[PDB]
Amino acid sequence: PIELLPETPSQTAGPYVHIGLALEAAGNPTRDQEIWNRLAKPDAPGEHILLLGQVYDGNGHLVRDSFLEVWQADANGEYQDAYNLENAFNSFGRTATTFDAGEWTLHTVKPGVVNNAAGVPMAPHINISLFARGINIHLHTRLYFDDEAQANAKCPVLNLIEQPQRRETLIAKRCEVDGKTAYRFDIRIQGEGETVFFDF
Amino acid sequence: PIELLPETPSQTAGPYVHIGLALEAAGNPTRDQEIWNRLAKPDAPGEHILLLGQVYDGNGHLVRDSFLEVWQADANGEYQDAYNLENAFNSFGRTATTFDAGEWTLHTVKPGVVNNAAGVPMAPHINISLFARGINIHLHTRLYFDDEAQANAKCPVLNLIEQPQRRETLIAKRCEVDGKTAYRFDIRIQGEGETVFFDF
Amino acid sequence: PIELLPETPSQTAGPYVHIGLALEAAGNPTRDQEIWNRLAKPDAPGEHILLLGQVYDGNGHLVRDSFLEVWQADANGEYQDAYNLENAFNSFGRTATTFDAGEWTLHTVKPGVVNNAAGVPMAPHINISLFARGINIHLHTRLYFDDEAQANAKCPVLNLIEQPQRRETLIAKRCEVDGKTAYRFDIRIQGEGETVFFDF
Amino acid sequence: PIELLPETPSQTAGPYVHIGLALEAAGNPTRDQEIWNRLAKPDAPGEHILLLGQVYDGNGHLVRDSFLEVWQADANGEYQDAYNLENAFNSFGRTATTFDAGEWTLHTVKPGVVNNAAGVPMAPHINISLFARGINIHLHTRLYFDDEAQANAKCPVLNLIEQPQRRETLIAKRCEVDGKTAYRFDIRIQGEGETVFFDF
Amino acid sequence: PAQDNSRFVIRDRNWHPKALTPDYKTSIARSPRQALVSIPQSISETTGPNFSHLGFGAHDHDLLLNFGLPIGERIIVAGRVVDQYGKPVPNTLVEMWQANAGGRYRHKNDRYLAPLDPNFGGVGRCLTDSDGYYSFRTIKPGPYPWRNGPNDWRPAHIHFGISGPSIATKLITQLYFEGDPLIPMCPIVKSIANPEAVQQLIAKLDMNNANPMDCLAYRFDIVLRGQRKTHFE
Amino acid sequence: PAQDNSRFVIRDRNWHPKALTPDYKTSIARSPRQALVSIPQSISETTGPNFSHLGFGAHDHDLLLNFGLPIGERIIVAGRVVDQYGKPVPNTLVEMWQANAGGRYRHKNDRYLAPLDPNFGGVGRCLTDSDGYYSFRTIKPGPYPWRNGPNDWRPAHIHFGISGPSIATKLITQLYFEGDPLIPMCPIVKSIANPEAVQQLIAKLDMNNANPMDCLAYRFDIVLRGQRKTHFE
Amino acid sequence: PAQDNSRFVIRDRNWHPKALTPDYKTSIARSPRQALVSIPQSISETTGPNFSHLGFGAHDHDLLLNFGLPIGERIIVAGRVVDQYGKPVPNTLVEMWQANAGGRYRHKNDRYLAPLDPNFGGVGRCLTDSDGYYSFRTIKPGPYPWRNGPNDWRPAHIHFGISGPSIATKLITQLYFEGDPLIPMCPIVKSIANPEAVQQLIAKLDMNNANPMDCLAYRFDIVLRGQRKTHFE
Numbered sequence A, B, C, D: 001p002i003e004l005l006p007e008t009p010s011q012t013a014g015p016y017v018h019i020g021l022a023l024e025a026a027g028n029p030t031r032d033q034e035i036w037n038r039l040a041k042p043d044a045p046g047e048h049i050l051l052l053g054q055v056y057d058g059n060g061h062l063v064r065d066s067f068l069e070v071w072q073a074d075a076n077g078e079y080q081d082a083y084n085l086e087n088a089f090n091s092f093g094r095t096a097t098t099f100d101a102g103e104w105t106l107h108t109v110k111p112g113v114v115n116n117a118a119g120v121p122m123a124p125h126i127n128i129s130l131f132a133r134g135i136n137i138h139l140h141t142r143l144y145f146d147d148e149a150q151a152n153a154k155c156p157v158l159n160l161i162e163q164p165q166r167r168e169t170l171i172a173k174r175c176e177v178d179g180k181t182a183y184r185f186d187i188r189i190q191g192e193g194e195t196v197f198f199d200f
Numbered sequence E, F, G: 001p002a003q004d005n006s007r008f009v010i011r012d013r014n015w016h017p018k019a020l021t022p023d024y025k026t027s028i029a030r031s032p033r034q035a036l037v038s039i040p041q042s043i044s045e046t047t048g049p050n051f052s053h054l055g056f057g058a059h060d061h062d063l064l065l066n067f068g069l070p071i072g073e074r075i076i077v078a079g080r081v082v083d084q085y086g087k088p089v090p091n092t093l094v095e096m097w098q099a100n101a102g103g104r105y106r107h108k109n110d111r112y113l114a115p116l117d118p119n120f121g122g123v124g125r126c127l128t129d130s131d132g133y134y135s136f137r138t139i140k141p142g143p144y145p146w147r148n149g150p151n152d153w154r155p156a157h158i159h160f161g162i163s164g165p166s167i168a169t170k171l172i173t174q175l176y177f178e179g180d181p182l183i184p185m186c187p188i189v190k191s192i193a194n195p196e197a198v199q200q201l202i203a204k205l206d207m208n209n210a211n212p213m214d215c216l217a218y219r220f221d222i223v224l225r226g227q228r229k230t231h232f233e
């Protein structure tokens, strides 16, 4: 067979990942421009939401040194790749869990619908990559919203998960924080209620 | 040491096993003669019973593509090896789980007692081989009956299972299906209440 | 010494060449545009001629599966390389022998004179590549006209053929087909009167 | 691939082949029982014929040290494999050419029709194997009769020879020797009118 | 009835694929976590069904005719069934199933976009002869993409099931074709740790068994657990 | 018009198959006995047709659609056309033809008993791009028995014809599939004396080019005679 | 009468010597220039004579007694005739001829200056037994000069003719003696391209079959085309 150059192998982000990707969190001075957890400016169009969650290890203990990266479409079902601190909305963001209580947060808008390669619409979702010490190669997952059951039931992606019970691990539960729309998304890396992780 | 020719390696049966060994299930036309789940004809001596079960994977989910082969003695404790559709009773049979509910059934007679190689009687039992996708090499088990407690307690085979709690996994629970004697034997491939599997 | 990448090796075209390069002959439906045996349209400048021939193997038998490609200058001695079906004249064409009689035909115009790399004029000629089953690598030849005796005698290419008797194998014999100017060029692949073939 | 034991390689019979297979010809005393050129006893059923011919080399010179072996069906289209000097007819025989004039002869009967593997009748024929010094591996051929044109035209075997002119090299020409039916079959090993040789 | 007169060579569980082979996804949740319990052989295990009297149809072993002609490479798959001691296994049941020329199976659950062949079923069964010989006639199956990794393709293969003399010898396996570059890439093939074992699964081109101008042939011999007589028991 | 501005690296007639290769029967009577006459390159030989303006149909290169769906292994055959100096050959004509999945050709003269596939023609053509890339989509052809020796079978193969920049570069060849055990046995393949040359004819499995759950891919690059500018002539 | 029940493995024409082998001068004009025409096996090719009822004399296989004693090395030449599948070929006809201890044949045309042996003929025949075994008793032939190149010497050899089950298996060969230095110089021997093939023609000294204080022995096994039953025809 045809063999291409091998891709550089992944390595754990390690415990100090914040020094490089979450300056504040590390408790270090940041720079003028930083990629953080606020994808939408209060005046961005769409239904503004607050996302939050915890990450648990195989023993049910909180993972407090995890780093997350998100990619989502804007309210029009559009990916805004030209990242700029001036935009009202950015498709990309970064978050990390607290060395205390250990909860991450993201301020964005609910994503519009995008079609898969075959032309079939996927349910509104947020793509997530999870990094942390002990994680050799980052984990891919998606966040779906419990208030979009109709769409979720027809997602070509959710529908690829053999077992219905596992599909549920990807659904964020709507709530409200200070009379603000919120969705909680807990990630269980291992064991009971273990979240669905993808390969693409 | 002496080495013989190596045995051909096993491979999983795959998900399409039915097209080859369970035509009906496959949803294909069958041939004149087929090996199926009816070991005894109504006019066969012995206590006529219906066996039924489900197969569970390690996540607690039904294995709906499993294939099973059974080997048992007739009511007089004799192994009838000359397979023939004209026979009132055949010692061999085949069954599979439904892609729906995922339950297999077998129509037979409660087997008589047979002695091990040392001349010690074994409790009435049905030998079972389980095949399916994800199973590299078929699993061997035995089905004993809860109504043969006295014999079960003295079985030289059951007694080889170190932990008594493990022996219980091999006991089918007597019941009735449409007011007819039946025994339920569920197989847990992995995890909690995992079924004992043998090597011979 | 310096070695470049090796050229991909030739393979015979096989007996089914027609399905790929001569659809009609294959007995298959053709596409909108096909490269065939009509180099000139009636309104093309030059002396309109019909070329025809047979191909013989070493036993004196017709090669009825041969495939030929031709390259010639227009009447003004110019090579028209931009192939187009709209053109009054195309420098390139293709023909094949009939599975019956085994004769190929080509509708063209007598080519003008062209100079070799040293600035010496070559007698009017048609370049031909012959392909068929049993031919590992295509044979190269040239078709000159018996009515261009004066030019033929001075041709720097013809003159490279050591034996004068061999030069005669390259001369098409002028004739008339349905009272129209034609030239017959038979190719003897091997044996008596074997056609000169070039390497370039 | 699967490789079997290799077959022992052939070697030329050499010039002295008669010492072993044609005792008389060698000019040596024969034994009580010898395999020779008279397949049919004068009282054998069928149309008794006399076969004769010469063998030529590539230069048109006679091959005077050749040895031939024949296999044919009896007049009923039957192969008589149990060889016995007592039978009226034997399917097998041997002949050799004269160190003088160099002509072989065989006394037999005209073979009946036999069907090929597909069930199609072959024209009456005599299978021949030719051996001689200079011949590394013996040559296979068949003898057909010119008076069976109808059958010859439909033979599945003759019909495998691409070129009609080559089919003719296998047809023996009827004649008469001393008012006895005869067919002459000359074998040209190489060149002009070269006989068709088979591989099976 | 059947009688306890034989013992079977113990299986080498390091030669066969292991239960848990993570690259083959399905095996994760379908593999026991507890050790297999070793038990001594008895009549229950040393006996098995004899299929000598099953009523076999005339084309049970001819996939070209048992279901027009199917499209694909006409081949004959033949071989012998012997035991570890090299002893033929006569009158044994050999069953097989495969995809069509395009890698489509004639099964409800198969959604692969390659089409079904109207003249092809995919099932064959043959009882071995006195010498342990079996043969089938079919078309060479095509590779089949499956949801394991994102770009996983099964090498062309034919599923085989062999009965042998007891439930102890019973085996389910897969045949692969000589030279197929997909072989070394398959996570199912790779479930087998010894490269030497993998080779046993590769059918070899058999020009000697081919029907000139008709069909090619593949040779595939199967070795079942060795059968010995009991001694000093 | 075309102009004489190029010279082509002389062909290595010991790399290419020779005219007379007796094991391939047909070559006996179809091979010249006299030596080829070497001639200097001129405009006649250094020029050739440009197919940039031929009107190509939308599925000219898609054998799956250009003729239902055909039965067989869906594959993509792609590669690049470069010259001996490693220089891409842009806007060049690549034409191909092959048998069906069973080794049957859609040609009058083909009498092989394997059936035609109603949805398969066997012809494709593609003009290479700016980088010298071409691609086709088809089904992998099957082996084909032919009347050479008594049991001769062609390895599965696709016939290729490439134009290049002049009549001097024009080539007709055959692609073979990686691992096919019939390769080393073919008298046509064996017409080529250097094993190294044979390797150039073998398309390699290309998992990187495959369409997951759809079709596999084979890589086949073609090297044409090297083109240089004339100097000191 | 005979029946069409068998098929014979196609011969390997690259294993046996080719027709034209120029160093063997006489092959030049006695080899066909056209290719052989391949034909399917039929009853005509798959049957042949059975010599079981031929009336062999008692000393037919004993060259020491079949023509005083011959002068020369007394030896036994024995071996077995098997087919390519390694199966014995019982009741088959084996014939041999050779020169005397000095390289002279008892043939008109032999004018070599080495004298004839009054007690030696040089011909023998034997029908193989149930096990495919044959044996002759003779004297070891001497090398023979021949008009090929100016100083050519045939190594000591015995000519053999073997029938087998059909005319498809019939073969003529030569046996050579272990370690003779002439073997590698012989043009007839050299007609065989593969040195591995040459090896099959060499009889090995066999001390085990020798008669102490009497004669030595050489072992020569012969392999005829593999015979198989027809299938799926």
Ligand SMILES: O=C(O)c1cc[n+]([O-])c(O)c1
Binding pocket: A012, A013, A014, A015, A133, A134
């Ligand atoms: O995974 C860890 O624990 C670890 C510790 C320290 N460093 O420097 C790392 O890069 C990783």
Ligand SMILES: O=C(O)c1cc[n+]([O-])c(O)c1
Binding pocket: B012, B013, B014, B015, B133, B134, E026, E144, E146, E154
């Ligand atoms: O185990 C599986 O998932 C599998 C899928 C498809 N085929 O063809 C198999 O043989 C096995």
Ligand SMILES: O=C(O)c1cc[n+]([O-])c(O)c1
Binding pocket: C012, C013, C014, C015, C133, C134, F026, F144, F146, F154
């Ligand atoms: O040269 C031939 O005879 C031949 C036959 C069949 N195929 O497929 C070829 O490619 C070549």
Ligand SMILES: O=C(O)c1cc[n+]([O-])c(O)c1
Binding pocket: D012, D013, D014, D015, D133, D134, G026, G144, G146, G154
């Ligand atoms: O072919 C020949 O000329 C030849 C001469 C002598 N012997 O002994 C042979 O075996 C063969």
Ligand SMILES: [Fe+3]
Binding pocket: A014, A016
């Ligand atoms: Fe670090």
Ligand SMILES: [Fe+3]
Binding pocket: B014, B016, E154, E159
């Ligand atoms: Fe499968």
Ligand SMILES: [Fe+3]
Binding pocket: C014, C016, F154, F159
């Ligand atoms: Fe071809």
Ligand SMILES: [Fe+3]
Binding pocket: D014, D016, G154, G157, G159
């Ligand atoms: Fe000799």
